[PDB]
């Protein structure tokens, strides 16, 4: 009964990237998602001789709260909250605006 | 006759060591880590079947586990059993 | 154990009271005696550690009545 | 000087060990107190 899932396209509601969009890359068990290309941090990656990493300032994506994102409704061009209904005996997601089934 | 199911659970691992390399080339003796409740007859029956090699004698000893400290928490490794298995002459094993 | 087998008497506890009413705890032992009772039906003697009150009971009820009670109580004799 | 603790494992286990506690009634009450307190080492016995 998770509203935001893996291949979903979301928009960001709060934080330093209020308004940007992206695809969720993975959702974490702690109630966080990593959305592709948004919450960028610059990690000072320490070199390891074994494992062959040269070590640099790697810029990568940090997790963000699921509460901070909503599924982008590409029809209206906005964010919509997600409801659940049963269609053909199968639980599907739909947008709370305009009642259209999320696919 | 030792049952065939138990003989697969007797042997744990070969033990690599400087002493193990010496005993293999001089006295022609392999060094095995065995199960703790395994006796000498169970090891001799297992090596003669699972490795297909002729065992002359098996000497065993129990290795007491060391006491280590991970961080600041004390801990103790497991007691394990060690077997010097002397193969008969001409026999060879990897 | 100081227990009459017939009547079930038992050492109870009380007080020695002095003239100045000083109370020290004492015991009241029952007047137990081991006695061989002739059972006429079974034609043998049965020893019972019995008080003198219980010997008055055996003289009144009869040894057959009392040994019925001791088996119904579940007591060896 | 000769101090008051002269150890002997045989005498340690016959006097304070597990089966010496379980033998008598009061020793069984000792193990019930240590379980109620929640001791890691319930007796002397290794």
């Amino acid at each position: 009964a998770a509203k935001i899932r893996r291949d979903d396209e979301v928009i960001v509601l709060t934080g330093k990237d209020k308004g940007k969009r992206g695809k969720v890359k993975n959702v974490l068990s702690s109630g966080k998602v990593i959305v592709e290309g948004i919450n960028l941090v610059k990690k000072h990656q320490k070199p390891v001789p074994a494992l062959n990493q040269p070590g640099g300032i790697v810029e990568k994506e940090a997790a963000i709260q699921v509460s901070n994102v909503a599924i982008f409704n590409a029809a209206t061009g906005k964010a919509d909250r997600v409801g659940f209904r049963f269609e053909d005996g199968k639980k599907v997601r739909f947008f709370k605006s305009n009642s259209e089934t999320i696919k | 006759m030792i049952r065939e199911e138990r003989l697969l659970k007797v042997l744990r691992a070969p033990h690599v060591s400087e002493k193990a390399s010496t005993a293999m080339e001089k006295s022609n003796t392999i060094v095995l880590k065995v199960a703790k409740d395994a006796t000498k007859a169970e090891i001799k029956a297992a090596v003669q079947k699972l490795f297909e090699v002729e065992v002359e004698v098996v000497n065993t000893l129990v290795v007491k586990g060391k006491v280590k400290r991970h961080g600041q928490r004390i801990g103790r490794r497991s007691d394990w059993k060690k077997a010097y298995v002397t193969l008969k002459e001409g026999q060879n094993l990897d | 154990s100081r227990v009459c087998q017939v009547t079930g008497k038992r050492p109870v506890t009380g007080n020695n009271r002095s003239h100045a009413l000083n109370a020290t705890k004492r015991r009241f032992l029952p007047n137990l005696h081991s006695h061989r009772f002739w059972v006429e039906s079974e034609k043998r003697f049965v020893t019972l550690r019995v008080s003198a009150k219980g010997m008055r009971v055996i003289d009144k009820k009869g040894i057959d009545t009392v040994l019925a009670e001791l088996r119904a109580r579940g007591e060896k004799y | 000087m000769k101090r008051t603790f002269q150890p002997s494992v045989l005498k340690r286990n016959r006097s304070h060990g597990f089966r010496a506690r379980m033998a008598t009634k009061n020793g069984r009450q000792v193990l019930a107190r240590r379980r109620a307190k929640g001791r890691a080492r319930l007796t002397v016995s290794k």
Binding site: - | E4, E5, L8, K9, L11, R12, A13, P14, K33, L50 | - | -
Partner: protein, 62 residues
């Protein structure tokens, strides 16, 4: 494999159980050295021995 092994006899499960345990031995000596580089096979065989041992107690004595 609970559906597949259930459609076997007592002697076939006993044959299969003896073939799993040889594989468990052969993985363990391989993992004793640094040769085994698929660590999940130790868990898969160990789970599959448990499925065979489960069905033997069902078909026999139950």
């Amino acid at each position: 494999k609970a559906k597949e092994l259930r459609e076997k006899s007592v002697e076939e499960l006993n044959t299969e159980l003896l073939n799993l345990l040889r594989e468990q031995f052969n993985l363990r000596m391989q993992a004793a050295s640094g040769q085994l580089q698929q660590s999940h096979l130790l868990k898969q065989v160990r789970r599959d021995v448990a499925r065979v041992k489960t069905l033997l107690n069902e078909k026999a004595g139950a």
